[PDB]
A = this chain, B = another copy of it.
Amino acid sequence: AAAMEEKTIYIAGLGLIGASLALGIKRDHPHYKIVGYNRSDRSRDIALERGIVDEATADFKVFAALADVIILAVPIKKTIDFIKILADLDLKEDVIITDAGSTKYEIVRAAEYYLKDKPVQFVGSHPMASGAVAANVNLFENAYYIFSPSCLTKPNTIPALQDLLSGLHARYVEIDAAEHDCVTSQISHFPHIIASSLMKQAGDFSESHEMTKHFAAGGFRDMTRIAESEPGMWTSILLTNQEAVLDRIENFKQRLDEVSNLIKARDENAIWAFFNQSRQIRKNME
């Protein structure tokens, strides 16, 4: 009777992520109704155009009570605002609510704080990959889709979303929200800080040393490519992952001081071991 399952999914935010999720849902559940919220007119019209969503609104509340599942695909701060607004609406009995934040822990806390006395389910989501024009059914193919449980996640919450989202072709993973934030700090957020700091360093140096622009090669290009990212999103990741990111920055300063001491001592064997060991590690992840 999978043919006959009915569902209304409300996606708030029809940017790249929200719209691509809509496309992944419809891919495996062609009969589910998708209803959309979006602030700006442009992304909302495209969405309506390409049958990505069946109805759309600029009033967040308008579709809330009707939804069997609500996915909040707006930035991190607005996700919390919308959680605040969902907390005093009369929503469907046991709606499953979820987000799509790059950082799990703060959003989960906000959900537990605001929704604890509502008959709702909540779980944190992070679909690990622009606007509704860049919408792509295959955005998440073979990428990890992370769930982070909350005290409002019931035994069936993750299973129901995993069924809902099967059309993404993602790899599902359950992980503690704080632990998620710790890991992604190290392999994504702090690297972005470094790439941005390095670009700014080299750019400052450039004004005073003209061959800088010209001698930069594949090494430098590759370590600065992610500097190109959107600053609103990176700012809210830093402000919602402060502790982990600060810890990485402080640990990285200590590592630079070890390297600087080795250079001052002209310690050739230690400097060699420093380069060799890292080379080996690289080869050993994978």
Distance in angstroms between the alpha carbons of A201 and B273 in the assembled complex: 15
Q: How far is the CB of A231 from chain B (nearest CB, A)?
A: 3
In this complex, what residue of B is CB-closest to A233?
B275
Number of A positions contacting B (CB below 8 A): 85
Contacts of A173 in B (CB 8 A): 211, 214
Distance in angstroms between the alpha carbons of A224 and B195 in the assembled complex: 11
Distance in angstroms between the alpha carbons of A195 and B218 in the assembled complex: 13
In the bound complex, do residue A186 and residue B200 qualify as a contact, i.e. CB atoms below 8 Å apart? Answer: no
Majority-rule SS of A interface residues:
helix
User: How many copies of this chain does the complex contain?
Assistant: 2
In the bound complex, do residue A281 and residue B203 qualify as a contact, i.e. CB atoms below 8 Å apart? Answer: yes
In the bound complex, do residue A239 and residue B271 qualify as a contact, i.e. CB atoms below 8 Å apart? Answer: yes
In this complex, what residue of B is CB-closest to A251?
B201
A40 within 8 A of B: no
In this complex, what residue of B is CB-closest to A192?
B219
8 Å CB contact of A285 from B184, B216, B246, B256: B216
Distance in angstroms between the alpha carbons of A199 and B265 in the assembled complex: 23
A268 within 8 A of B: yes
A66 within 8 A of B: no
Distance in angstroms between the alpha carbons of A235 and B268 in the assembled complex: 7
Segment from A4-12, A93-101, A175-183 that makes contact with B: A175-183
- Which residues of A does B touch, CB under 8 Å? 128, 144, 173, 175, 179-180, 182-184, 186-188, 191-203, 205-206, 209, 211-217, 219-220, 222-232, 234-235, 238-239, 242, 245-246, 248-253, 255-257, 259-260, 263-264, 266, 268, 271-279, 281-286
